[PDB]
């Protein structure tokens with residue numbers, strides 16, 4: 304139906320369809336040269352996906368327009384009636400392949416860890432993530448009713464949203480980067496200095512580009528450019544899946560705008576809770592630039 | 593009629609219409625805050641005009657699309673039947689104004705020198721200029737028959753083309769920069785490092801821009817961007833004036849491509865002649881990067 308309730312799998316709340324996609328996924332075979340883009344929802348998946356695809360296409364914009372980003376970078380656990388699962392889309396994806404997922408480590412196909420697949424993880428401060436997720440819940444009909452912002456924020460703090468706990472997600476993948484090749488990025492860093500981050504990515508994937516081509520990538524991976532690029536702004540998907548009139552996928556693309564949504568009371572409650580949850584974590588985020 | 597013969601004024605060969613525009617121009621009054629873009633044809637007039645207008649509009653692309661570049665930056669000596677002379681277009685151009693000319697110092701309105709108007713001069717190596725001019729002569733019907741490339745090159749060496757001698761032009765304006773505020777740029781330098789040159793321009797016009805806005809200007813003043821921008825590629829002008837099917841205004845935008853046009857014999861003849869003409873000149877160009 305519409306806005307169906309989430310379904311729990313191994314302690315993780317998942318969109319019904321995606322939970323179903325986990326069955327077939329057990330057969331997925333990762334290749335040594337795959338590159339997995341991993342993120343907790345709304346942390347910059349699309350953004351880093353466009354960056355990586357441009358790098359992979361040698362900065363050739365025309366090639367990057369060959370199809371929408373969700374087509375160029377198969378969504379691993381994706382599934383929907385009548386549409387090939389991301390796992391199927393991956394059957395005709397040429398190597399080297401770029402893959403996307405939001406799956407907690409507990410649901411991640413073991414094959415990706417055994418094959419030592421290079422991982423590009425992107426994290427974003429929890430407040431901007433929460434707000435971005437609140438609006439995403441509204442336009443992406445596949446999600447359950449978000450309720451009021453206060454109610455959503457409450458569910459967000461206990462990980463009772465699609466894909467579970469933000470706190471758990473950013474922490475476990477941070478810890479994984481110790482026994483697995485993982486480049487851990489920050490949405491805020493990318494906002495601060497795009498080129499600097501794009502250069503780290505280039506080094507991580509062991510590639511090189513002319514200084515001029517890099518500046519070219521920077522420009523076409525900017526919010527302004529990606530907002531207007533129909534191959535990255537998701538405006539080509541059926542309104543039944545994503546309704547941009549309710550809230551555009553490319554919303555604001557800023558770091559620190561959570562401040563116009565969080566009330567003073569919610570902020571104090573959130574900070575308190577946040578300190579307990581991130582206590583023993585060496586990770587350090589920036590709520591604004 | 594069509595492709596009429598050039599008309600000489602004070603030793604300078606000029607397009608008939610432009611020579612006529614010199615009469616009214618004697619009344620032109622320069623303002624202390626004007627900025628004059630000066631160049632020998634095909635040295636990067638349009639290129640630096642877009643750069644300056646973007647800087648003047650604070651990097652706002654929308655504002656830079658308000659009209660074609662020849663509208664935003666009035667062509668001082670321009671004239672054509674039924675169209676307001678550049679001098680007229682300058683009556684409704686708000687200050688601070690950006691102005692364009694190709695006029696040798698001998699025909700330049702005295703008012704511009706007396707008012708100490710800041711000048712941005714751009715020079716380009718003679719070989720790329722000649723070749724670029726040869727193709728421009730073909731598409732811009734206002735010019736007389738260019739003849740064969742060999743014939744044109746011959747007329748170019750003796751300054752028997754529209755606006756006279758390239759050698760005289762680049763040299764006199766270079767000498768003017770000693771008693772007048774003049775920022776003397778090189779097309780090749782801009783090709784080499786766009787940002788570096790855009791930063792020199794910013795300093796010259798005593799303005800500043802956020803690092804990010806500067807990178808923005810760089811991208812939108814790139815050949816690729818200006819070629820597709822109808823407000824800078826001249827595709828909006830009547831085909832009777834400019835026929836892009838014969839040769840696009842935005843041709844190649846490269847430094848060093850003269851080598852695929854000049855024959856070995858023409859090259860040796862040109863170098864010999866060039867050495868005599870540039871003997872006592874401290875100016876130094878680069879034929880390639």
Ligand SMILES: Nc1ncnc2c1ncn2[C@@H]1O[C@H](COP(=O)(O)O)[C@@H](OP(=O)(O)O)[C@H]1O
Nearest residue numbers: 345346347348349350435524525526554555556
């Ligand atoms: N090029 C870009 N620069 C900055 N932010 C971008 C961006 N492209 C997408 N985003 C932002 O990334 C968030 C979506 O994340 P993901 O792609 O993982 O779902 C949205 O944030 P907001 O909702 O705050 O605007 C979206 O605006």
Ligand SMILES: Nc1ncnc2c1ncn2[C@@H]1O[C@H](COP(=O)(O)O)[C@@H](OP(=O)(O)O)[C@H]1O
Nearest residue numbers: 634635636637638639724813814815843844845
């Ligand atoms: N952004 C840009 N970068 C490099 N060259 C540019 C440019 N914009 C215009 N040009 C080039 O400048 C020359 C025209 O000069 P002007 O504007 O003074 O008439 C043409 O050179 P070519 O004919 O070699 O391609 C044109 O291609």
